[PDB]
Amino acid sequence: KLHQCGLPKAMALELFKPFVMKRLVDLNHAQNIKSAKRMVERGRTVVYDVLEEVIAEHPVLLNRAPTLHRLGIQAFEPQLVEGKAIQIHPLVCTAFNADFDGDQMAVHLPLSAEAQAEARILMLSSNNILKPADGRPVTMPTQDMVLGLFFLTTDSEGRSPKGEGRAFGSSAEAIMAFDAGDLTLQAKIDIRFPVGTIPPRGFEPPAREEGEPEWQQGDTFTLKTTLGRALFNELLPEDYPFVDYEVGKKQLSEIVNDLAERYPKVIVAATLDNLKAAGFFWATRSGVTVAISDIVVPDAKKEIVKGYEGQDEKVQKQYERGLITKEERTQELIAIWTKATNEVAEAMNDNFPKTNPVSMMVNSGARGNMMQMRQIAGMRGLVSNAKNETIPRPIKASFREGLSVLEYFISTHGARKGLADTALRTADSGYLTRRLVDVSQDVIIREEDCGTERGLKLPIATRDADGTLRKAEDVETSVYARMLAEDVVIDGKVIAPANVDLGDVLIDALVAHGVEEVKTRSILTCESQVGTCAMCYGRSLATGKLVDIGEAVGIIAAQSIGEPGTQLTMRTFHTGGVAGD
Amino acid sequence: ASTAPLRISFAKIKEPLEVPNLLALQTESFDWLLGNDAWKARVESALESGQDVPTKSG
Amino acid sequence: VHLVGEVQKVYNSQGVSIHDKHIEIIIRQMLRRVTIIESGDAELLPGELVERTKFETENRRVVQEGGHPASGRPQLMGITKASLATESWLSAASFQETTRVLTDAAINAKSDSLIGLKENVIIGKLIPAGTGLSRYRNIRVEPTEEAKAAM
Amino acid sequence: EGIINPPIDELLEATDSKYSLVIYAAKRARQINAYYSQLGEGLLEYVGPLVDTHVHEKPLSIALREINAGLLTSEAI
Amino acid sequence: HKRRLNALGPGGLSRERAGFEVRDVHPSHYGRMCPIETPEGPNIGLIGSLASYGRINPFGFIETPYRKVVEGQVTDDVDYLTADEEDRFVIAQANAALGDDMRFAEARVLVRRRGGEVDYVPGDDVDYMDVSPRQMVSVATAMIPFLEHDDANRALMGANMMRQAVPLIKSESPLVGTGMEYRSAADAGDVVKAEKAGVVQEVSADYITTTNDDGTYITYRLAKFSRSNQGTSVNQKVIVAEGDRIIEGQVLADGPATENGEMALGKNLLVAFMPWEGHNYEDAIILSQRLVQDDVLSSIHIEEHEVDARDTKLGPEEITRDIPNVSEEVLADLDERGIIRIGAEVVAGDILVGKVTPKGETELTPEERLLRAIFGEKAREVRDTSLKVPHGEIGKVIGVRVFDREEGDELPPGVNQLVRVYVAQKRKITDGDKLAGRHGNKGVISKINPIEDMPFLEDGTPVDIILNPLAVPSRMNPGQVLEIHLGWLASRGWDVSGLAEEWAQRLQVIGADKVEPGTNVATPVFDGAREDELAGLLQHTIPNRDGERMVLPSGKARLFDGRSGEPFPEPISVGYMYILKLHHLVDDKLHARSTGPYSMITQQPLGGKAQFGGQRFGEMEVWALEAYGAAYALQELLTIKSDDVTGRVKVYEAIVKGENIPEPGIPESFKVLIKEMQSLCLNVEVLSSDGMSIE
Amino acid sequence: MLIAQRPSLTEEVVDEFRSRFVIEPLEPGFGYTLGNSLRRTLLSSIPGAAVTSIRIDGVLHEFTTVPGVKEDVTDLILNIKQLVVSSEHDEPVVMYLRKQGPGLVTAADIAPPAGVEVHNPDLVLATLNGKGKLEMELTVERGRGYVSAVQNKQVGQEIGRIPVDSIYSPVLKVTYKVEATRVEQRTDFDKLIVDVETKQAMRPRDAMASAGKTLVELFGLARELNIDAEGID
Amino acid sequence: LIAQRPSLTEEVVDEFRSRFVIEPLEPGFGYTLGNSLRRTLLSSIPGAAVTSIRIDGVLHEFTTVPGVKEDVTDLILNIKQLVVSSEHDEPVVMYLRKQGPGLVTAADIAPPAGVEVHNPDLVLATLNGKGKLEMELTVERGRGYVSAVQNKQVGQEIGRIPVDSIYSPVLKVTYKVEATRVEQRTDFDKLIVDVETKQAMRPRDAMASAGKTLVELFGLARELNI
Ligand SMILES: [Mg+2]
Ligand SMILES: [Zn+2]
């Protein structure tokens, strides 16, 4: 479960030596303390039984070496387990950035009553759903489970939709039909729902037809959906409104955030666990694989490229007579091949079906990226020459066909440079994080309420097309999770009361009313005799509630700044022959 | 002939040159340093074959 | 605004997002000090860094005394200079540069008050952030009378 | 029968914060542990677990159980 | 290790002096320094392996071989070119095709020239071409099959990993691999090859005797279970029969990780690509209990720890069975002079050799005095200091060596006797063990299901290992999929005769047409089997049973879920993949600590596994803990759990007695610092608000 | 050689129709065998009776509307297949339902023939506006497991008659999960927890008793090959 | 509606491989039955295996016996796949002795009364003219797989050495399904399971034991109810 971690027998027994000794002497398994020491060193079975009795209800902080942000150290319930490696919950792995290629993670023991109380309340692995960087879920990774859910909530054409165009009395009979094999998981059908099933949020205005008042918001209602969507929704809690759209990765994050906002923590953890189980099961059934026939090179590629080659060699011919300078030939050839690789990328994009495994696991957001499939199937394209140049002859073969010898060499030219750049950037990112944390200390929240009313002007909605109002594209990182200094009246009536953190409903209402800017309170204008007040800083982001007095905002800010330093890894593609520009 | 166990080859192009003694880098260097019989033997072999080589030992 | 927007677009170029309050705290830290100019009545040196709160305090003292206030212009400097020029010499000494900061701490005979975080991690005392605050740690506990009456 | 067995939300709304909850439950856990280790002096000040107790238990689980039941109260000096 | 070219060293480019330019590949590194393989650590690129055909100029430059071309006719003559002479001429590519005659088949031919340019030059204009397409790749990278399809990064990781596979109990050569493993095994010094062409006369496990026709008799002694530098066995098998003829350089005895003179760094397993209940999430691996059951992945490990009977100022040390203040049964398996017998299983705490201190000034404490008076036991000046197996260990002793001062053997000054004991165990593959293939796909074992839970094939064969498909698209190493399909092809023979197909014609002319089941197959590193060949052979596999082929033309197969029992909804890709057991074994990584040794200059716990070292709570850990607002946990983790001598004994006593944890004091490192800055003439004084403070 | 701890089926009831059944520690990896075989047999092998066709007065198969009723035909089909019938005739049997006037027509108002019992008279089948006019006849037939709707040519025989999907299984669903338990210091024991949801007609425990008896017969069919002993209890 | 009870028919395809057909199964029933049968046929079957051995002049498996080209560990690997049938519920001792030059095989091992080696054509080692092999083997009976670690019970006998042993004598099972000829919408499926096992026992009694285990489990489930 979400708050459990496995400790091998030896490590648990060695960590808890004082406690195992105390428990052994108290139960008279051992005569005296020294004999208890001898018996634990011997490692008799009764010692392991006492250990299983003593670890429970005692938090242990699992902690990885980089510990980039405060989710690095997380408390867990320990649990004896055979073998010699820590067992961990795959949901929390992405919080650590902890892959399973090969990775060691330290275990620390809270000793005092205060320490274990803190690990119970504060550092618990289930009370840290939201990453403090921007206030979004980080504890729903996507490598495998999300593929399962995506395959589960998918429209037709994923297979031959047999058993399509029928209605089933309830999800149970639909499942029975599914085992019978007549129905397939991906097929549109009309499904009933027992009372209490809250319907789709867009289903509310529609209802059944009758001459009497009806309340379909909380009674029976048929619905044209898929059995998969029924399974997905019955993973989510009953009170959660039905979801009738494909989940993928973005919408899964959306619904997880909604759950984290409107529900208690325990329900959030249980829902995540159900989602995990169903995701693994249906990813197993998803049948995603890879084979030689899986990656089909587009047929058109060869033809188009030879056409380009003809043009290219023609250019080469008219360069042999001196009619064009070498620099001009290089530039026009680079442009030609950029055009060629864009065209072949589009052709490959059109060619590959939606049912193939790579499409399923790249569209869903499980793992991968469209240019990676581009250079697995289509030709790689232009590759950077050493010290940031562009070769004249790009690679015309994809990894399925197998690169040539010089092509492989000139690809290594960029690969090794990428490795070295990655290493230098992680070093510099660590240094930057240290500097930010060291300047940013001392800034603790030491006052409930500011003394002042001054605020900061922020643009609520920009790029308003003619005859309409359009909200800012990046409104979330700017104005969300901030407290209004003062109220707003636009029609003479108060719309957004003072000192309320902003969410989707209020932002939509204010945009609809047509206001163009807002006066949001923020730490910059904060006038606090001692540090900074809680309301100026607004709501925390890892908790979704007002920032408690005394929280360490400086350390969280510095860590959030520094965490994606390793992730940036962006550099100018080419100097262009000019320095200082 | 019977140097290695049979292994079906999917190669398409014949290779004129065979891979050299893969450990030549260390053994020949120390042979040269010692200047023992082996280094001078290779020196005279190169000289009669016309190949250049340092004829003074280390 | 310029710093917030610039750093935010630099981060967004890759695709990562961070909330602007994280940036704003650091930015307020960088702008904290002010360069004093025309240090006639204030009697201290001209053209050196001074904390904003100290500037406001001394200005209030001098205007109350009747002397005209000494001018000041806000000054922005890097995080490193801001960190080094801090009141707690122990925290700065725990930073990258030790010899110079320790040397001027000794020559100035400045006592490091233990308010803040890093220096209270040096000493081993309780950090004044979270469970270490006075108001959270002074509470006393006892059940109700009805709990004892029941048992 | 778990770390998350007493849900946190009731505790937060009871104590109005989160850090105050940690320190207050910690003080109670210390008191119950001191009582359990009396071993015979029987000081009148010490008070045992108000809620039922298992044969072997951690003091903090009982402290948080008491907080959830709400019979326990705090007061800042 | 032999062929590496360490740029780091005295009078040269040090780690600090490294820049961007030196690490980056150069167009000159072609046949002179492998660009694929290098350590991935901070010293990335500084250290590289010599190319396969590299040779050293006497002045110290590196040469490479190139064929000679004249009037468009490549000749069978070779010249060795250094890094400068290569610039003047224009060098072609070995991959360029050639006609039936020795001339070029195509006027257009890829070429490279000065400055690393790759422009083409059609017709008879070149003079030199690469002699073999594997010139640019070192031995390690040359081993990978289907290298050309892998990304450079994954091939780099696969070259780095292939140098960590431990030898197993029984080694098997790759079913699919480069054709070069034979040379790599043979020229390596591990293997034992004959120096005369004769007839073997006596074959045995320990030694093998041969008789050249001249008359000389030579017996080679095979090392057996002798510890290598990495604590791994070097067991050498024997291949030759009694009366079989021998030729010069022929192979007689395999080495560690070898088979019939062919390199064998691991076993080949049946792999199927499918997510499986999340136990292979994030690239972890699921493998059958068949491997645990049949010792397919099991490796011997021999540890050697020794103790010396030195003479101190009090007196000499004795290696005796009469160790003091011990029970009787602990010294059960010891020998006469206090040495563990050979073949006696040991465990943590077992006594290997019994050593006792000469003496020491013993001032018996009052409690000890009373207790000794009660029990009538005499606490003697001789004190126990015997060698014991470090914590967390197991093994059967295989050998013991004793060296004595008074004997003719020589020893360093002081040490009267020295004793070394070998403890050897057979580590099987278990959970947490790090496994990896050739193409940089690595993972820790996460679960070993029974043989039945494995999704089995149409003929009942369970798949020996499950791997997450999600790895291969992003990792951009589809070479492993190619390898899996070709491994399946190698396992089940194929017959191609008179098919009149293009790939069929290529196979027939190559000679790889009629292949029986099981025989190995070779795909050179840059002349591998085209995907057309794989497709055609998949069409024309030998029927393994009943006349049906279990793998469809697509290269996938019907997988029956072992647990549920129903067939999986769609076919699944399966085949034979070569995996290796890395040396990143879990047993060596595991380490815990209640309380143990403490450092001296600062009283904090010391580091490392060999000395019961507590993990380091770095700066970023305390930053994260502050971010949580957790202050008391920080106080305990800085003062109680280290760096305070008074508090550690108190907390241990309170925990054992059940009393509540006591209030922390001040840390010792702070007093070290205040004393140190007191010795720089800075009167660092700790003061209170009301005058002097209490400490 | 003998099993360390013998299993023992136990029950946990949260509703009269919903139930959970727990198997104690079991031999290693046996949890999936028993769990999935139990699921499939409990879902399919148990016999039962459910409607097989419906006939409305004065409608055509293509004419999906029914005069005099506010509700449509497809929801009526869903409702009728929801209803549970216990029949034993072993052949097709017919049931009638004739109701007029406005109001609500329910399973209670259905008149069953001899030997066929309707178990849940509470279900509301349809609502009438104005004159009800409703006349209806539905065919019931005992059978096993689950079968999808097919055309029998009843529509050709009588235009009003149409096929309908059936639920012959007395149980609605089985969800079985296998977890780990620790016994005599060993974690190699698997606990099976089977959640059985069944209709109001038949109690879940009797249904699984029937399923277990059927599996006992079906696997003891393998005793005929030879007589052999295996460790038990 | 139609009632038809399962019926089993057997056929032999080899001296140790058989195919068993059960026609009247329900739809979607053959796969699960075949899978459960396979799971129990591989997991729990009574068999005999070598649990420990002894060699003269050898104190551990790592060393080598003079005169034989394969190290003792190779002998562990060779005997580990030896297949035996033991009727004694207690451990039994067998003796393997071989002098002179020649191939020591599973044929020449001494069988005690009631314990039989079933693969005499296996080759265990080869001895030289000077060589000499003496060996004691302990055969026990059980089910499943047991590693050497839990089989060690004698400590003072340093000469004794345990070996990981495998008891299950079945090699593999493969089940498939079809559609019956009976005209109905159910389309009852015909489960056909093919079992091939080692030379220890005929597949008939192997599946008899599997059926006994499963029928006992399901009877335990049944009787405890009602
Ligand atoms: Mg990692
Ligand atoms: Zn404020």
What can be said about the biggest beta sheet of chain D? Answer: none
In oligomeric terms, what are we looking at? part of a larger assembly
Can you give the helix content of chain D as a percent range?
40-55%
CA distance, first residue to last residue of chain D: 35 Å
What is the CATH first-level class name of one domain in chain A? Mainly Alpha
Helix/sheet category of chain A? mainly alpha
Q: Name the ligand types.
A: magnesium ion, zinc ion
Distance between the termini of chain A: 55 Å
> Given the C-alpha coordinates, what overall shape of chain D results?
globular
Distinct helical segment count of chain D: 3
Helix content of chain A: 40-55%
Structural class of chain D: mainly alpha
Instruction: Write the H/E string of chain D, N to C.
Output: HHHE
Q: Number of DSSP strands of chain A?
A: 15
Structural Rg of chain A: 30 Å
Could you describe the 3D structure shown?
The structure is cut from a larger assembly and holds two copies of chain A, two copies of chain B, one copy of chain D (77 residues) and two copies of chain F. In chain A, 43% of the residues lie in helices and 7% in strands. In chain A, a hairpin with a 3-residue loop joins strand 11 (384-385) and strand 12 (389-390). Chain A has helices at residues 9-15, 17-26, 33-42, 45-55, 90-96, 113-121, 145-152, 171-180, 227-235, 250-262, 265-286, 300-320, 326-351, 357-363, 370-377, 405-440, 475-479, 504-513, 534-537, 553-562, 565-568, and strands at residues 7-8, 60-63, 73-76, 80-81, 106-108, 130-131, 136-137, 167-168, 189-191, 223-225, 384-385, 389-390, 456-459, 483-484, 517-521. Chain A has 21 helices and 15 strands. Among the domains of chain A are: 144-286, RNA polymerase Rpb1, domain 3 (Enzyme I, Chain A, domain 2), CATH 1.10.274.100; 299-420, Topoisomerase I, Chain A, domain 4, CATH 1.10.132.30. The longest helix of chain A has 36 residues, at 405-440. The longest helix of chain B is centred in the C-terminal third of the chain and has 13 residues, at 37-49. Chain B has helices spanning 24-34, 37-49, and one strand at 8-9. With 58 residues, chain B is mostly helical. Chain B has two helices and one strand. Chain B starts with 7 loop residues before the first strand and ends in a 9-residue tail after the last helix. Chain B is elongated and about 45 Å long. Chain D is built from three helices and one strand. In chain D, helix 2 (19-36) crosses helix 3 (59-69). Chain D has one domain. Chain F has helices spanning 30-44, 73-82, 154-157, 204-220; strands at residues 10-13, 18-23, 47-56, 85-86, 93-99, 103-106, 117-118, 124-128, 134-144, 161-163, 171-183, 186-198. In chain F, helix 1 (30-44) packs across helix 4 (204-220). Bound molecules: magnesium ion and zinc ion (ZN). Magnesium ion binds next to loops of chain A.
